[PDB]
A paper describes a structure:
Using a newly-obtained dataset, which allowed multiple rounds of 3D classifications, we determined a final map at an overall resolution of 3.5 Å calculated from nearly 150,000 particles. Using our 3.5 Å map, we performed fully flexible refinement of the model to obtain the final structure. The experimental refined model, while close to the original design, shows some key backbone and sidechain movements that result in a tighter and more compact designed interface. The rigid-body subunit movement consists principally of a small clockwise rotation (≈2°) about an axis approximately perpendicular to the 3-fold symmetry axis, while the largest differences after superposition are found in the three helices by the designed interface on the 2-fold axis. Another difference is a movement of the sidechain of residue K23 on H2, which repositions such that it forms a hydrogen bond with the sidechain of E52 on H3. This interaction is also present in all six subunits of the parent aldolase crystal structure (Fullerton et al., 2006), but was not accounted for in the design model. Model refinement in Rosetta allows convenient use of Rosetta's InterfaceAnalyzer application, which calculates several metrics important in the creation and optimization of the original design, including binding energies, changes in solvent accessible surface area (ΔSASA), and shape complementarity. Applying the InterfaceAnalyzer to the novel interface across the 2-fold symmetry axis shows that the movement of the interface helices increases the number of interface residues from 52 to 56, with a corresponding change in the calculated ΔΔG from roughly −30 to −37 Rosetta Energy Units (REU). The InterfaceAnalyzer provides a breakdown of the contribution to the overall ΔSASA from hydrophobic residues; this shows that while the total SASA is decreased compared with the design model, the calculated ΔSASA for hydrophobic residues is increased, suggesting that the refined model has improved burial of hydrophobic residues and provides a rationale for the observed differences between the design and refined models.
Here, we present the structure of a protein complex called I3-01, determined by CryoEM. This designed protein is derived from a trimeric 2-keto-3-deoxy-6-phosphogluconate (KDPG) aldolase (Fullerton et al., 2006), modified to introduce complementary hydrophobic interfaces resulting in self-assembly into a hollow cage with dodecameric geometry and icosahedral symmetry (Hsia et al., 2016). I3-01, comprising 60 aldolase subunits arranged with icosahedral symmetry, has resisted high-resolution characterization. The I3-01 complex is large (26 nm diameter) and hollow, resulting in an assembly with a high solvent content, potentially making structural elucidation by X-ray crystallography challenging.
Numbering used by the authors:
A (entry chain A), B (entry chain Z), C (entry chain Y), D (entry chain X): 1 to 201
The structure:
């Protein structure tokens, strides 16, 4: 899995108001070149969307679940075929469950104390969230004491600063509203703009 | 079926060099607002593409087959779930087969003699091909002797003249290379431009 | 209680160097239109001030306790008639005690991990502190994964930015030194300026 | 120990790529007037460097260990004669060990919740890290609810802002790359510039 992040260098963090909106947006994103799509559990019947998008997996997409905040949600996400589980926070109970099921799990951290607590569970890739608050500087600071930890920031990434996150040394960037807000066509165009900007830095 | 043509007012006539290209282009077209997609039998394993795109049917797409030139091809297209069969020409053998299977069939004509030969088989919607040769004038001429026949031209339709075909009085327009040539993103953008231009005329 | 926050939209976080200073400042704040006053346990004999200000409760004030950092302090605050308990941090022991006594309790969080740990205790209103560090952006980021959590930032609120906190979507703002620093008259005037600015946004 | 921090008002947080580099840099720093040197466990055989620099202790240096992230590392640091242990985070297990051995221990915090959790262990001096993220504002905010806690920020300190950290009211500043990056001569010169700038504010 880690290798997939390194290759693609972008995750779409997809939020929608309905099942229908979610599926159409997932397609708009895929076509642009963003092969990693995270279906958030803030989408009604998110579980359904994860299963019904299984036809994209065959085309080279890797579909995961986001905003997973309990072991009960996590189990539904894995059973429904999620390729990876992402949480907003660090959770010991979910981390244990995923390990037994062998599903890659990316917890969230914001502080050195949360960071170390994650590392003791064996995690070396961490979600940095909210990114816009801690900023690119956080990643540069962490490189010092923890050379072997890599971050995927979520929140605040846009076409003016996406290259600064990469110059600091992140693994990949997650993009929310800056990507997926708009019509299905506008979204596809924005997605292209991100991939070109990343491959260019 | 006729009602679907009247509502959507556009068909994509999809040609590709591979199975993979075809599926990605079908998606680029769908998202833009073009709900009628014709998978031509000039695409290698076109039959496969028709079946594997069945997940779009659930989203409101109607997927058919194009350039069907024998009863043997037609049967494979129908068995694979094609929603309609389109030929480049008028063929008595295919017309008979489709009627028994109850699948809408749109033959091709170019001349008044081919036109009348079709009408005697009970067809009232005809494919006009190649459109760029006969031009918009053909449709205006046919309105006279055959008020009850409607055309769907294919070939030569573009963003400079698509409204002239509608002002003459066609049922819908089929678009080939002018739509589907380009990258998956460029295609989606072109598709939007067509739908907006038609709804505007 | 929640309803009271929604109506008033401001809390004074009162710090003083003596019992006498605290009571006079509480009055300066009340008269201006700020009906929610938090008496911090950094005021000597804070407990006394909470009891002796009980005559304001009859006039429509709701007087609570702030900077409550142990179960021992909390019990004294509740026994002395505090209408709500506010802590600088999330504390399981205090949260349990207040629940049994039925006194509204607003814990502090700074990180998504602290946030979720609070939600599991049943808290939906959280103190965001220090606000000036995390900024207005934190609230916008949290709206995504936790649509059902609302914040009351403390620290950094002033007459130049108080409307940005509201546009992000906070429940209410707590104001410290920017309000309560100055003479009893100057404080009353500042309080008026805040209420007018909030009602205006 | 606290008294030593108050007197010197600067710590060098030393990172190096080899044993040899570390020893030469420790000397460059010492001569400039920075008597507190923290040998990070990111230096290969950091333990060796701590022991072999014991000749500086006689000259008035106080040599400690940094980036100590397990009880196993901590024990080696103390046995090797470290004068103080610094961690990147708050750790209950290390805090207990050091207390029994009587070695001053400075944990890391970033949030009010981490802060209070430290205070319950009896710590009144805290490492604030990463400083550049939380900024000088964090210290001003904490002065309110916790008048009796003092910070030593690490990260982001430089010759343009070192006086702002002191005006907020920190105990001392830790300096990383802004000091120790460069040749042994350049480092000595930078060290002088820091001491003069601090004594001047």
């Amino acid at each position: 899995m880690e290798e997939l992040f390194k290759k693609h260098k972008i995750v779409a963090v997809l939020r929608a108001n309905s099942v229908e909106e979610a599926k159409k947006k997932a397609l708009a994103v895929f076509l642009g070149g963003v092969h990693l799509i995270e279906i958030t559990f803030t989408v009604p019947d998110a579980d359904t969307v994860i299963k019904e998008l299984s036809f994209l997996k065959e085309m080279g997409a890797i579909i995961g679940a986001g905003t997973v905040t309990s072991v009960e949600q996590c189990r539904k996400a894995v059973e429904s075929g999620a390729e990876f589980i992402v949480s907003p926070h660090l959770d010991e109970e979910i981390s244990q469950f995923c390990k037994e099921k062998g599903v890659f799990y990316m917890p969230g951290v914001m502080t050195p104390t949360e960071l170390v607590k994650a590392m003791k569970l064996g995690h070396t890739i961490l979600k940095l969230f909210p990114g816009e608050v801690v900023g690119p500087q956080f990643v540069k600071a962490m490189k010092g004491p923890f050379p072997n930890v890599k971050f995927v920031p979520t929140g605040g990434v846009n076409l003016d600063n996406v290259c600064e996150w990469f110059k600091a040394g992140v693994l990949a960037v997650g993009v929310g509203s800056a990507l997926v807000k708009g019509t299905p066509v506008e979204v596809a165009e924005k997605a292209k703009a991100f991939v070109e900007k990343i491959r260019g830095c």
